Structure formats: C-alpha cells, structure tokens
Curated annotation (Swiss-Prot), chain A:
Signal sequence annotation: none
Gene it is expressed from: WDR5
Keyword set, alphabetical order: Acetylation, Chromatin regulator, Host-virus interaction, Isopeptide bond, Nucleus, Repeat, Transcription, Transcription regulation, Ubl conjugation, WD repeat
Protein name per Swiss-Prot or TrEMBL: WD repeat-containing protein 5
Function as written in the Swiss-Prot or TrEMBL entry: Contributes to histone modification. May position the N-terminus of histone H3 for efficient trimethylation at 'Lys-4'. As part of the MLL1/MLL complex it is involved in methylation and dimethylation at 'Lys-4' of histone H3. H3 'Lys-4' methylation represents a specific tag for epigenetic transcriptional activation. As part of the NSL complex it may be involved in acetylation of nucleosomal histone H4 on several lysine residues. May regulate osteoblasts differentiation.
Effect of residue 17 to E: Strongly reduced affinity for histone H3
Organism encoding this protein: Homo sapiens (Human)
InterPro entries in UniProt: G-protein_beta_WD-40_rep, WD40/YVTN_repeat-like_dom_sf, WD40_repeat_CS, WD40_repeat_dom_sf, WD40_rpt
Subcellular location: Nucleus
Crosslinked positions (Glycyl lysine isopeptide (Lys-Gly) (interchain with G-Cter in SUMO2)): 16
Quaternary structure and partners: Interacts with PAXBP1; the interaction is direct and links a WDR5-containing histone methyltransferase complex to PAX7 and PAX3. Interacts with HCFC1. Component of the ATAC complex, a complex with histone acetyltransferase activity on histones H3 and H4. Component of the SET1 complex, at least composed of the catalytic subunit (SETD1A or SETD1B), WDR5, WDR82, RBBP5, ASH2L/ASH2, CXXC1/CFP1, HCFC1 and DPY30. Core component of several methyltransferase-containing complexes including MLL1/MLL, MLL2/3 (also named ASCOM complex) and MLL4/WBP7. (Microbial infection) Interacts with herpes virus 8/HHV-8 protein LANA1; this interaction regulates the MLL1 histone methyltransferase activity on viral DNA.
GO molecular function, one term: histone H3Q5ser reader activity
Amino acid sequence: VKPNYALKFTLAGHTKAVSSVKFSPNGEWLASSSADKLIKIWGAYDGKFEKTISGHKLGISDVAWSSDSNLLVSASDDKTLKIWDVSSGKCLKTLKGHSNYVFCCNFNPQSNLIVSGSFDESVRIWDVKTGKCLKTLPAHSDPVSAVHFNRDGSLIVSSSYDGLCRIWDTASGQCLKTLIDDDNPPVSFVKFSPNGKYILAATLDNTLKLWDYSKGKCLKTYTGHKNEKYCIFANFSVTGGKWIVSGSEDNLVYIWNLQTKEIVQKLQGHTDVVISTACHPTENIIASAALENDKTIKLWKSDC
Amino acid sequence: XXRX
C-alpha cells in the first residue's frame, strides 16, 4: 500500500558531478557516469566501489548496460560513445559520427545495437560488433534528451526540448508516431514501459506524464517534484509495489502511486539536486545520484 | 557534462 525506503549506503569517489546511474540487469552492480570523465562501478548489495573505467576525453552524460551484463555504453561530451567490456574494464569500440555532445544511450533488448541521442538533434543507430553507424535520423528540430527501445526492440522512442516525442521504426528508420496534444513543454526523458504499451515522459513544467502511444493520448499525470532546469531520469518500479520513481530539483527522490497519481513517499538526505535514479531488477532498491554539491550515490531498500 |  505504501513503500518504506531506508537509506542503506552512501557512496562517493566521484570528483566532479554525477550524471547517470543504471543498475546491471543481473542485479549485482551499479554503474555511474560523471562530469569527471569517469565510470565507476559499485557492488549493488554491499555498496562497495568495484572499479574505475576511463579514457573518455570529456564528461560522460549517460551510460547503460548490455543485456548479457557484458558491456557498458557511455555517451560523452567528446562527440563519441564508448563500448566497454566491463570485465576487463577496457574500451572495445569507439563510435564516431556526431556534430555535438552525445546525451543519451540505451542498448536494444537483443543487445546487438545501440541508439544514441545527440545535441545535433540526431538519433543514430550502431552495430555493436562492427561499430559502424547503421542509420541516422534527423529526429528533432532540437537536441535529444533520451532514447530507448521497446520490449522487443522494434521501436525507439525519443524526446527533445522542442516538445516532441517521436517513435521510430528500428529497421526502416521511419517515424511512426508523434506525441504532441496541446501543452508543448520541453520533454527531458522517455522510456517505454516493460509491458511496452505505455511510454513515460518527463517535462520541464514539473510534470510526469504517461501515454498510451498506440492510442496517442496521455492517461495519467504526476506532480509535486521540481523539474525545470535539469533532464532528470524517470523510472518504473516493478518489484514490490508498482510506482513512478524520479529525481527532483528540490533535492528529494519522488515516488508516486502509478494508479492514484499522488505521492506515496519522498526520500531526503541528498544535499543537492537529484539527476538520476535507478531500480534494482530483483530486490527493492532505489539508487540515486546528485550534482556537485553532493557528489554521492545513495542506496535505498524497502519491504514493499 | 551536457545533462549536469
């Protein structure tokens, strides 16, 4: 009925500010990216620092795991993405092809491909073996805040500051649907749902909106967190309870009832803004990271 | 970071 999240661990080691944190699909490790040009890896359970991954020329804005929990992909300010074999810690391929910073990255479910959003307003697609860029979509009139595939990997949603959510056809390269419907706020994040039928969108009007895209309409909307400046990750929590989990610019982590849309619980102790949250695949754990007045990833466990 |  309501979750109780407890701060368990606070971890630091990051010099400059943190950008993303994502949990590995095996529910073992947490990977983190930061303005320190680095990727640091933490035992999901013990909260312990595992290894540094580096060799990017500039700040990493995002990172995501492969399905086989082999690999990391990191999108940086250096115009490039990197593919890291996480075991060794060494860079496999480097993917080049952007006008500008690379903001967002996610692997496809099948994990042979990567989709990359960029401040040159393109969504590009990349072959994980060869390393060459397959297709390039002039997605928006504006820089891309997010990219994700769906359950099967047929669809790629992307969001942008221009207000748009375009959904793309992975094999063709065609834009299939577009989610507009009045408003026109800047959209700072999207991912498809696990059941894939609804897609979630963060906006800079301090909003969080859920959409049934087939039907092309908003269902429910969640508020109260402060999101104006930063593009702040938004999660589904499938494990114990079914929640919406997001960072905030008032320094709190927000959790909403997915049905009743009003807030179940908020977490404090973060001394700055929360840019990224991530949920454990198996147990109930939120990880959260904050900007340079904090520089810490906090770990949170619940019974529901 | 850009995103920060």
